[PDB]
Design a protein around this ligand. Structure first.
Ligand SMILES: [Ca+2]
Length: 475
């Protein structure tokens, strides 16, 4: 018998893919979405749906595959998909408010969806594991979701494990796995042990101090992958210091990104050359740059700052107040390293450990930089991020960022339906954000997986982090 025990990060007492928020239904391979993020190109690809169109971004048309069936056997047709979408809008306010769906008419396998208003980024919302398609003619959602995954649910123990049996008629080709145990444990080293003791085959996010021990075990492999989140120093352009391009350029060099990968992240991360990961279809190639305490001086010089007896221009000291916070324990360390480099070069930094990012609007005033963090391309689209962080009106715009050329692009971008041009515009906004150095992008933290190399075949660690248990896995 072919069995895989996968031991997961996070627990849950529900398997309602609509209320859940842990995305476990999709993670354990019960459940799937109309549309996915392709592992090869990192773009929005059809899964449950074959294709889509929108002349105008408001009237959307989705053709679905004619060959899919739910685990219980029933056909998956537009009506079924209507039901599921609907059950999902009437059950989660988050889903309701994000999908923006006015109406959904059904016929055969095509669907007609009308968003409240033109929603160019509508399709990318269907990637959300939340909107995974389930059979609604099947009542026990907390404990028994019936979806289209390669694994049907056998049994469920809230707060503990779930049990899954291969589904024999899975539309994309049946697992060779006889069965999977998908279980949860919130303690990182408990996880490490479980793998070591051989009580688990695959562990997600194993302990960082231990990672050294396991790795070394004869037969255990650890993979790591780039995620969509990026760490950065977010700047405050309402400050005169930073209104200068070269003052920014300089901050951008004061930190040695590789040393963050190693001295702090421990290797559990990758250098960011920007907000977007290289593999994305809309990421720029970047000139490969040298960046240390030396190179800082040169930019700060061009800007008009020399070190006298303290960096200064004219009569006033150069300094920054760099906020940081608790929620992410490596951030305060980047903070402390930044101030250690600042001082080598003439600059004092007040490191202020704030709690919450609300402070930026309230404290408003004082602060120059914050050791911050965003997911920039949550399901292959960067339109929300960019608009939020860069457009004058942007919800998250706290650096009083307002560059009309940029706003130019974001504007066309928000009025643009076609996936390939959305792509072209994002590269430009990216490019432009580089040239003008609007923030400093430090690292991309890694999702990390460890597993028994000799039992487990074809584990892929996915960037979206939505995909873990899948038909491809074997023992
Ligand atoms: Ca069977």
């Amino acid at each position: 018998e072919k069995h895989i025990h996968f031991l997961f990060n996070v627990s849950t007492n529900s398997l309602d893919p609509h209320v859940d928020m842990t995305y476990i239904p999709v993670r354990a391979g019960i459940t799937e979405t109309l549309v996915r993020v392709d592992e090869e190109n990192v773009t929005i690809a059809p899964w449950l749906a074959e294709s889509w169109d929108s002349t105008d971004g408001q009237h959307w048309t989705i053709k679905l595959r004619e060959d899919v069936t739910f685990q219980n056997g029933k056909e998956m047709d537009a009506e079924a998909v209507k039901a599921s979408l609907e059950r999902a809008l009437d059950e989660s306010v988050a889903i309701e408010n994000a999908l923006k769906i006015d109406e959904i008419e059904a016929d055969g396998y095509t669907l007609h969806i009308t968003t409240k208003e033109p929603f160019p980024e509508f399709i990318s919302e269907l990637v959300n594991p939340n909107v995974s398609i389930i059979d609604v003619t099947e009542e026990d959602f907390t404990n028994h979701p019936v979806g289209t995954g390669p694994f049907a649910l056998e049994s469920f123990t809230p707060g503990s494990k779930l049990e899954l049996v291969r589904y024999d008629e899975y539309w994309d080709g049946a697992s060779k796995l006889d069965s999977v145990t998908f279980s949860f444990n919130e303690d990182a080293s408990a996880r490490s042990l479980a793998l070591e003791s051989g009580q688990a085959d695959i562990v997600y996010r194993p302990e960082v101090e231990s990672i050294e021990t396991l790795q070394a075990n004869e037969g255990i492999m650890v993979e790591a992958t780039e995620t969509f989140r990026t760490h950065n120093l977010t700047m405050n352009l309402d400050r005169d210091s930073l209104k200068d391009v070269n003052v920014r350029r300089a901050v951008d060099v004061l930190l040695d990104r590789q040393e963050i990968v190693d001295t702090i992240m421990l290797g559990y991360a990758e250098v960011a050359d920007g907000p977007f990961i290289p593999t994305l279809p809309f990421a720029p190639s970047y000139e490969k740059k040298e960046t240390g305490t030396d190179i800082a001086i040169q930019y700060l010089e061009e800007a008009g700052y020399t070190l006298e007896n303290q960096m200064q221009k004219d009569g006033e000291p150069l300094h920054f107040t760099v906020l940081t916070y608790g929620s992410r324990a490596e951030l305060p360390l980047i903070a402390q390293v930044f101030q250690s480099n600042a001082k080598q070069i003439g600059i004092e930094v007040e490191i202020r450990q704030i709690e919450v990012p609300e402070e930026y609007m309230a404290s408003n005033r004082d602060w120059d930089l914050i050791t911050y963090s965003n997911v920039t391309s949550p399901r292959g689209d960067a339109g929300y991020y960019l608009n939020a962080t860069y457009h004058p009106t942007g919800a998250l715009n706290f650096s009083s960022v307002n560059d009309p050329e940029l706003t130019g692009i974001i504007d066309e971008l928000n009025r643009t339906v076609d996936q390939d041009v959305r792509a072209k515009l994002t590269e430009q906004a990216a490019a432009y954000i580089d040239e003008q150095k609007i923030h400093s992008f430090l690292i991309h933290p890694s999702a990390v997986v460890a597993y028994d190399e000799n039992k487990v075949k074809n584990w892929v660690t996915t960037r979206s982090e939505y995909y873990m248990i899948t038909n491809q896995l074997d023992v």
